[model samples]
Target chain A: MAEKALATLKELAFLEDPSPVERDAAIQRFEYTFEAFWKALQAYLREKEGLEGASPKGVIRLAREVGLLRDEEARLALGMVDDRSLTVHTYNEPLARAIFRRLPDYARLMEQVLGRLRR
Target chain B: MAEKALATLKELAFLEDPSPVERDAAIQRFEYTFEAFWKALQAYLREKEGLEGASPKGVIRLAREVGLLRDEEARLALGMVDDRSLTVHTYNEPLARAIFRRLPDYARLMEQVLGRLRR
Candidate 1:
């Protein structure tokens, strides 16, 4: 799913049509891409690293411990989980604006981890 | 947008986890990635290919005329648009298995079109 994460993460920042609908699309992409990557984290920790975590934050810490994620990335990865929860409440465009503000940093953090995984 | 569509289309079938959540995740990825590609077609046609059409099927037809998609792929892409509408009703796992069965075809179609665009 690393590839899926990279795909969803690819055009997130480049979605120039920032209409509410467009931002909603970007937000939705972030949620699932986040899901795929976190699972990749879980899979890597379990199979290759012989480790596991029950929560998103736990996964981040363990990933950091294993040197798969840097310290700053670990921090944003945590926030990504938090915001991912909010992305679920996509009843209206309320969070779209909020997520739009932070979406750049979010994609960068995930992209950073993705780059490390590729290496 | 094309880049993001390409990224999301990545590793979809590679999502090794067959848990209910994982299927749901895959369904979600397909929806947005489809959205990204259809829009990419629209943009490419409008800006690059110099053509116009409304709606997904319309765009597909125009894409065919301009030769961005194969005839077989056009059929699957239309099915993708149909299944993508259903992905929004993801509250239960009933359609999960159904979409799971069709999801690979969906991803392959999008990936096929994406590859066409990349070339």
Candidate 2:
């Protein structure tokens, strides 16, 4: 699960580079990364804590179980996961750009989690 | 204009905070700040450079006039301003969340600009 999440994040990082030629690739990678990260996180949650749900809140609950985050970070991360769901599932353009703009921070957060999981 | 822009950014900052009780206040402040910043930026552009368009590109061009940014930062900033426009003008929720999540970085960037302007 950690490996998959990291791979997905790599895709997102590539997608978010500023070069125009790479942007399309970035978007494609972003989509895959988005889905993969969500799935991996959810699975990790279930595997570690026997919690089972495919929702943002579920992931947050799992994060709490593993002691990976506090209330604020968990809430924020879950909220972002929900936002990601909206962007990917609804094809929300404005949201996509907003998410794209924060790719740097998101990458950092991903690194934090990956580090915690020893990935 | 700097004062107004700063005030507006303050509102965005408040809104983006994690506290739920303060969130509504933050959202309200974000709206006011959004409008004020947009208007101030547009007017500043028009007055300073005779640029009349109330658009993201216009603001980017104006930033160049004052030596506020390079091409990459300008494009990214302009894109953010455009994302802001969408959030304000079109009520994009996912975009708003994405923007909200990056409030810390946005605050930092605003500080960079204010520092440049000596505000």
Candidate 3:
């Protein structure tokens, strides 16, 4: 689900000068992607590392400690969660753009982390 | 945790004509309160109903189906989750006021739900 959401986010985000609607769609996709990814990470922590993550950042930090993410990757993932938190305010044009602009980076980060976790 | 957070949210929210600082603090408290409340609801659903909730709204809706909340209560709880979502952008004064104004209703609703769930 996270992978599919990331793909859609990438598709919409890659559009040249996307309209407000497209930008909002991308942000919405980012929201779902972030949720799925973090929850998956939460499960991974519990099942693979005997750990529990009480929150999104907690999950990311634990994943980092478990060697699932690097320092920079965890930083970006934390920022991604912050961006995801602002998604309900996507009606604000500036906030929408700020989060939309980061979806590609987030998408790539998610894909890389998921790929690494699979190995 | 949810109860304590709700109390703090009520403390800051009840201040008459609160300053921006107080408003923001109340909103921050609302965020944590909402998180703890819904997550508690999620646990309650799984343990009591043998059901799972994938998201905050999902948990509230499931709780409603289990006779944990009324129709209007569920609607209000859904709105509470929406308001909680906007909490990250509390720096926007208008947005701050918009969410801050709803904390009282949310607090009352949460208290009612928790009370009923406890019985």
Candidate 4:
């Protein structure tokens, strides 16, 4: 599920010049993809590492400690967590664009993490 | 800002048979619209009712107590609150459409409350 959602998000995040509607669409994709990414990580922790994480950040931290996430990847993952919150907390043209700008980076981090987990 | 977002939400919510992109778009609008709607209500509480509410539900309950929201509207508003949270917590085709179906009703409650505040 995370992989599929991330694919759609990547499609939009890589758009040369997306319209406002397109940007909004990608932002929504990022929102759910983030959720699926963290939850999958949490499941991996419980199953592979025998550790449980209670929150998104907690899961990312656990992954870092378990060598599932690298130092920089964990840092970026934490930022992705905040961006997810920002989506629900604020709304305006500039902020929307600002959040949309981060989607590409966020998508990359999730993609990399998923690849790491696959191996 | 709430008005504009709500207008966009209404536009998408009224679609007879929206595609996945369209449904996702409307859900995104609902996410932000729910934020703007509650924040505006908080401002109304502070300015007009001289009551302060620190959270969405707090502000909503205050609105109900202050006669800004009707009984049924307040109930539906709270349900909208849950739906907004659901958008972030889960991602699947079924749940997405389920939440999208509720957008129209949520939009109506928000529109009614906005009209009330205008007066």
Candidate 5:
């Protein structure tokens, strides 16, 4: 997942005058990175929870089961994941823009979770 | 920038969760909106770009310059504003949780531009 994210970033960096085609490619790559990261995290959470299936909800439920998250936080995280899935499936322009706007903060949260795990 | 975006969203009547503590009053009330948005975007890009201010150069500059963003889509909208700014300014449990989980789709870029914007 990290390698894929880095590759996406590299692709983004190489565009000199990204045409519509280039932009679509970057978007696709970015979406793939997101999916890759989510799947990696889901897998990690599943292992942490010692669960089977490795579903998204299962990840969240496992987090809760392991006391990794408070109930409210777990619920909100689950909802956010669901929303992200919907946003990806629907590809709403406005929503996409909003999510882009919030990406930095979101990325930070992921980093924090990773940091916590490292500790 | 962050709150203003939300205010804009409030004006749009999309999702309603106006917690003075959890939402608005928690940060800068005025520039809180734009500043938070900008800071969040900047911080994330700072990490991702391995340079300062990448996403902001893309989204906030694009949004403010083009007038192409709306509040309803604030959570995931790209090119509407700097994606990292909102993250730097606002750090909390709910906000973080909200952002962390749904970020899978947030990386997609709709408007592809050429060249790196100086962050």
Candidate 6:
């Protein structure tokens, strides 16, 4: 998405100000990106391999098996699911903040999937 | 992200194939980009505006009120949220498939939002 996408972690470095709103927004973006990645991987598995993964982690495991997502993307696929579920299901403020901090890492992985898929 | 980011909807073009897998991939990209965009927007809004939008719709409305997103981006922000929720909560195969199709459009919107934030 970039020759140094401003969307890179550098974009989030402006946390010099209050961060609650920013954290929430970052989390939202992660959700949408995750949606795009898993669902796309879902279609890839179903259409290409004639398989259906019933849940998010299921889809990632299947994709990694089929070679749709590369190592990092596939690896984080489960991590993404767990982090998302934890924040959404329980809303532990610290964990949610922890998840928010990791948005860049998640964004990069999701982008890597997009990058590989394009190739 | 670039003078013509591959992340643009153009990346999804190879729909000449069965498209299900590809559509799935595209949707995934949209999600990640959406994550980057909204969260960045969230950060920008909070850091820049001293506002917090509790929901996706709220963020867009607040963003629009402050003139962060352009007309189309703002308009589609709500649509994006609705469509996102619809597909995720209800598995209506037809609707999910339908949502899958609109992924390119969603990706473009998200990219545009990303573009705005980067500037």
Every prediction's TM-score for the first chain?
0.85, 0.64, 0.93, 0.94, 0.56, 0.74
The lowest-lDDT stretch of 10 consecutive residues in candidate 1 chain A is A87-96
Error of 6 at B34 (Å): 2.2
lDDT of 5 by residue, A35-97 (tens): 554565666665665555366676667766776666875665565565444332222345544
Q: Which candidate should be chosen as best, given DockQ against the real structure?
A: 4
lDDT tens digits by residue: candidate 1, A1-119: 55654465456546655643356556655765677778878887888889978777888999999999778878878888888766533432465467767888877777777777667
Q: Which candidate is the best by lDDT?
A: 4
Q: Model 1: clashing residue pairs?
A: A4-B10, A7-B7, A7-B8, A8-B8, A11-B4
Off by over 4 Å in 6: A1-119, B1-10, B13-18, B89-91
Query: Residues A69-97, candidate 4, lDDT per residue (tens digit)?
Result: 88998998998888888887444778778
* Model 1: per-residue Cα lDDT over B21-88, one tens digit each: 35544555566566677887887788878798779889988998888877887777787778766654
Q: Is 1 or 3 the stronger prediction by lDDT?
A: 3
Predicted candidate 1: interface RMSD? 9.8
Report the poorest 10 consecutive residues by lDDT, candidate 3 chain A. A20-29
Off by over 4 Å in 1: A91-94, B1-119
- Model 2, stretches more than 4 Å misplaced? A1-21, A88-94, B1-119
What is candidate 6's CA lDDT for residue B64?
89
Rank order (by lDDT, best first): 4, 3, 1, 6, 2, 5
Q: What fraction of the true interface contacts does model 1 reproduce?
A: 0.00
DockQ of every candidate structure: 0.03, 0.02, 0.03, 0.59, 0.02, 0.03
Assess each prediction's global lDDT (C-alpha) against the native: 0.68, 0.51, 0.76, 0.85, 0.42, 0.59
Residue A41 C-alpha lDDT in model 1:
80
Give model 2's clash tally. 2
**What are the runs in model 5 whose C-alpha is more than 4 Å off?**
A3-30, A46-48, A70-76, A88-91, B1-119
**Location of the lowest summed lDDT over 10 successive residues in candidate 5 chain A:** A20-29
For candidate 6, give the lDDT. 0.59
lDDT of 2 by residue, B76-101 (tens): 66666655544422122354456566
